[PDB]
Paper text:
F420 is a low-potential redox cofactor used by diverse bacteria and archaea. In mycobacteria, this cofactor has multiple roles, including adaptation to redox stress, cell wall biosynthesis, and activation of the clinical antitubercular prodrugs pretomanid and delamanid. To determine the structural basis of dehydro-F420-0 production, we solved high-resolution crystal structures of the enzyme responsible (FbiA) in apo-, substrate-, and product-bound forms. The crystal structure of FbiA shows that this enzyme employs a flexible active site to capture Fo and EPPG, precisely positioning them for catalysis.
Similarly, FbiA crystals were soaked with Fo and GDP, individually or in combination, and structures of substrate-bound FbiA were determined. In the GDP and Fo-bound structure, the coordination of Ca2+ is analogous to the GDP-only structure. However, the glycerol molecule and one of the H2O molecules observed in the GDP-only structure are displaced by the ribosyl chain of Fo, resulting in a coordination number of six with octahedral geometry. The terminal hydroxyl group of Fo is significantly closer to the Ca2+ ion (2.6 Å) and to the β-phosphate of GDP (2.8 Å from O and 3.0 Å from P) than the coordinating hydroxyl of glycerol, which is not within the bonding distance of GDP. These bond distances between the hydroxyl of Fo and GDP, as well as the central orientation of the hydroxyl of Fo toward the β-phosphate of GDP, place it in an ideal position to act as the acceptor substrate for the transfer of PEP catalyzed by FbiA. Determination of the fully resolved FbiA substrate complex, in the presence of a single catalytic metal ion, provides a clear picture of the mechanism of catalysis of this enzyme. In this structure, the terminal hydroxyl group of Fo is ideally positioned for nucleophilic attack of the β-phosphate of EPPG, strongly suggesting that DH-F420-0 biosynthesis occurs through direct transfer of PEP to Fo, via a pentavalent phosphate intermediate that is stabilized by the catalytic metal ion. As no acidic side chains are present in proximity of the terminal hydroxyl of Fo in our structure of FbiA, it is likely that deprotonation of this group for nucleophilic attack is EPPG induced, possibly by the PEP carboxyl moiety.
Residue numbers in the entry:
A (entry chain A): 1 to 93, 100 to 326
B (entry chain B): 1 to 326
């Protein structure tokens, strides 16, 4: 009755919604449920900005599961304004509702509360119906090393600045996980991975959403050691118009945007890797030595479809 | 050439506007500027709230002179929204009694981040003023902390408590029994950069008709500042903030009562005193129809309503004239 999912980004929040729907948790609860959902949430995008601490993935899971996301925009609060952002532009340097979260979190961190407890405190308001554990209570911020065009020097940029400003506009060389080597697995993270009935890798971006969770010392070891089946979900959805575009962050590490490539990225637990099973969308193929591969529908069209997706993860692992 | 004015918030900014219109400064600039206006701004109301630093007096002048102030509120931005404040309420956090506007919050965020990175307030203020272009030099009385505290009888328990000015003013609206003010940090605060010099090199120094106990007073509590006023060669002209028989914006009467000073122009004048003896004033202007005696102080009844920048401009002229300054 214990399921733990590693997540990052909007897609992670959507996958958790499916988990909740299948198991009657959170918004989808009819009576008190038989299951506990634990999310090990990416902190690689977290940043100090404008004197306040911003944790996008933890916030996106919290708001999404708490039913606070705007149905028509898909991101951000309902009836959001960006007046504070507007004045910040005028000052020459982030919704208003979003800022309140930031002020509260910042006040807690500066008063000594670790992020895990900041998160629990915010979740008393949102009541996501899930345990959202930050991968780490220490800093571990995903950066991108570019060739800077002012002087030609390699520089590390915060992933967030890279994504808006520099992506596809200057040469990019690698990712750096700033602070990761000095970070420890956040409270409960190794325990949540060790005691689970099943561990699911959400179909988030493998490099910058699941990937940085894996750079936290202790987390990768937990995954290799745990007796819970580990089932990963492919993030590659073929069949789009013009056959889609390759993933920009997989490009940075020279990894093809195929279910086969992302699968080899995580690799087989039978070997040095992390996966016992690997789900791909129907019509897609992957053969990976040691890894059970199955094509099923993998579109998170709504919680009902994601619930089917989660159900197929249990079945491949053989978990009830 | 050089005018230095001690100011609070809404009233100091309003008086400062009069200075600007009289001299063709800031928003009122019509051709080459012949004058330099320096404001020494009260920092006694400054407070940390929700993890961000609030400087209401500096902000209100900054917003007012820069054409951003809320016309009917007198504090905070025009067309302000309060969604961020609303969300703080929804999270159930404290204090829920202090209005952090969404537009206003950006100032607080930029200011808080710069101070935390070691920038002194004076530099934060100049930086913020590059966007607003107030047309005046807004000097914090000090780059160090000097916050007015209020000794009340707390209505929860009947106990004596000290509260920050913000809680006295915003939460209780000065309606709790009030016993004294403490200028916590003033004796340890150094006069801000340029403040003593602006007082010394001024052709004239003007005390805006701001709140005497909680707006001008706390400036005068910074050790360096009071000496500059006494030791300066520029005449010091004060404006009574009390228009006897006419209630005015703010709680000046309540603040005067705490320090046991009658709400009359003569009493406020004597509060500040005469430079001939132990005081600070050379001159002291009051509203027409008001009589005031101050030994050592030239007192002149003149119109004293800040109804508009043109009317205030005349008020400024009457100080120059009483000082004998051109
Ligand atoms: N398999 C699968 N992957 C998806 C679906 N929707 C989105 N994704 C993947 O989710 C990734 C983006 O999600 P995420 O890592 O959470 O970061 P985000 O950019 O903030 O949304 C994309 O690279 C997609 O490949 C879906 O329905 N199925
Ligand atoms: N003489 C005079 N004083 C005024 C007038 N309008 C407001 N005041 C005074 O100015 C004070 C407010 O200025 P200040 O203390 O800087 O504003 P605050 O800090 O925002 O309260 C009030 O307490 C009033 O007594 C006016 O027209 N004439
Ligand atoms: O009465 C109020 N005055 C508010 N003021 C005015 C200020 O608190 C006091 O009027 C001054 O301290 C005294 O003049 C603010 C000033 C700021 O710079 C920033 C925020 C506020 C918020 C309030 C408020 O919520 N209620
Ligand atoms: Ca298609
Ligand atoms: Ca004030
Ligand atoms: Ca000091
Ligand atoms: Ca004293």
């Amino acid at each position: 009755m214990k399921i733990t999912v590693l997540v990052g980004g909007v897609g992670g929040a959507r996958f958790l919604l499916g988990v909740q729907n299948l198991l009657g948790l959170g918004s989808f609860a009819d009576g008190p449920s038989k299951h506990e959902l634990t999310a090990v949430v990416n902190i690689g995008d977290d940043a100090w900005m404008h004197g306040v601490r911003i944790c996008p993935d933890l916030d996106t899971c919290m708001y999404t599961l708490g039913g606070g996301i705007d149905p028509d925009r898909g991101w951000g609060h309902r009836n959001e304004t960006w007046n504070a952002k507007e004045e910040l532009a005028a000052y020459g340097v982030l919704g208003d509702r979003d800022l309140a979260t930031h002020l509260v979190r910042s006040q807690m961190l500066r008063a000594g509360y670790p992020l895990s407890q900041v998160t629990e405190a915010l979740c008393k308001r949102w009541q996501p119906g899930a345990r959202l554990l930050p991968a780490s209570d220490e800093r571990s911020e995903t950066h991108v090393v570019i060739t800077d065009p002012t002087d030609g020097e390699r520089r590390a940029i915060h992933f967030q600045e890279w994504w808006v400003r520099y992506r596809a506009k200057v040469p990019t060389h690698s990712f750096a996980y700033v602070g990761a080597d000095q970070a420890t697995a956040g409270p409960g993270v190794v325990e949540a991975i060790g005691d689970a009935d099943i561990v699911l890798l959400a179909p988030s971006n493998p490099v910058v959403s699941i990937g940085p969770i894996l750079q936290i010392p202790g987390i990768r070891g937990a995954l290799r050691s745990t007796s819970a089946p580990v089932i990963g979900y492919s993030p590659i959805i073929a069949g789009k118009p013009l056959r889609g575009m390759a993933d920009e962050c997989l490009k940075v590490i020279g990894v093809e945007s195929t279910s086969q490539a992302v699968g080899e990225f995580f690799g087989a637990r039978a070997g040095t890797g992390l996966l016992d099973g690997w789900l791909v969308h129907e019509g897609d193929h992957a053969q990976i030595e040691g890894v059970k591969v199955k094509a099923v529908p993998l579109l998170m069209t709504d919680p009902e479809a994601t619930a089917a997706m989660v159900r197929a993860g249990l079945d491949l692992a053989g978990v009830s």
